[PDB]
């Protein structure tokens, strides 16, 4: 039924290296400060647009 997977660390490392081209390579969520879901919710509620964000 293919509904659950258990992997070993040497396989996860290889899969992680192969997909690096699609990966942000960030280690934190500080990059999304004032640019995350809560900020956009607040801007929509306050009828304002963060520069570079949704309007």
């Amino acid at each position: 039924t293919y509904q659950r997977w258990q992997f070993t660390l040497p396989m996860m490392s290889t899969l992680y290296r192969l997909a690096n081209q699609l990966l942000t390579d960030l280690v934190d969520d500080n990059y999304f400060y004032l640019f995350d879901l809560k900020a956009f919710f607040t801007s929509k509620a306050l009828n304002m647009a963060i520069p570079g964000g949704p309007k």
């Binding site: 934190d28 500080n30 990059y31 999304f32 004032l34």
Partner: protein, 222 residues
């Protein structure tokens, strides 16, 4: 040994000193009005003549205190307002200045964003005291001084210009003099423009007076 009071509170940053000579004024009679001059000075420093703000770092010296012998003339609601008025007038002769609260900011940021921290600070009258590596960590600590008024949104500016990689905590440190001279009518201020430093004090004084509901300007006199 001539100290009478210690500012608006028991530990206020102002001092009251009597320089009345024993020959010129009888000290025993001066003791009758000491307890009232102290209260008048405390209240006057509590209010302040410029913009109803505290007075700081000012030494008041009494030079001559002519006292009426009749106790029915002195004491109570007659000598206290006189003391407050003389405190105000004496303060106003020596060039009054305003004082900003200065914030102490510590910023932790990677090595590359240190220059960005400098750039953010430079726009808000900030003055960087020191940057230094954190031993055993790849980050740096920048310690700087920023005026409290030129600090609103500083944290947000720093965290946005650096993409969240720099974080700052600010705490009150000391009081420093505003660059301008509050008592100078020559300066013309527009309603909605930032002012140059040469006359920041004049704006800070008149706008605070308007906010408090007082008159538009002081009446420098005796």
């Amino acid at each position: 040994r001539s100290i009478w009071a210690f500012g608006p509170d028991a530990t206020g940053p102002n001092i009251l000193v009597d320089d009345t000579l024993p020959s010129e004024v009888d000290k025993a009679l001066l003791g009758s009005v000491k307890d009232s001059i102290v209260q008048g000075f405390q209240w006057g420093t509590r209010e302040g003549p410029l913009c109803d703000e505290l007075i700081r770092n000012v030494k008041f010296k009494i030079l001559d205190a002519v006292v009426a012998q009749e106790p029915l003339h002195r004491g109570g609601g007659q000598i206290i307002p006189t003391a407050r008025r003389v405190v105000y007038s004496a303060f106003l002769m020596a060039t009054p200045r305003l004082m900003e609260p200065y914030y102490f900011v510590e910023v932790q940021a990677p090595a590359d964003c240190v220059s960005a921290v400098y750039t953010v600070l430079a726009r808000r009258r900030g003055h960087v005291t020191q940057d230094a590596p954190i031993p055993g960590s790849p980050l740096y600590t920048i310690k700087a001084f920023i005026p409290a008024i030129d600090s609103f949104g500083f944290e947000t500016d720093l965290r946005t210009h650096t993409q969240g990689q720099a974080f700052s905590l600010s705490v009150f440190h000391h009081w420093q003099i505003v660059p301008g001279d509050p008592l100078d009518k020559s300066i013309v201020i527009r309603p909605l423009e930032p002012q140059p430093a040469p006359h920041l004090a004049r704006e800070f004084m008149i706008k605070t007076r308007r906010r408090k509901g007082l008159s538009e300007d002081v009446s420098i006199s005796k």
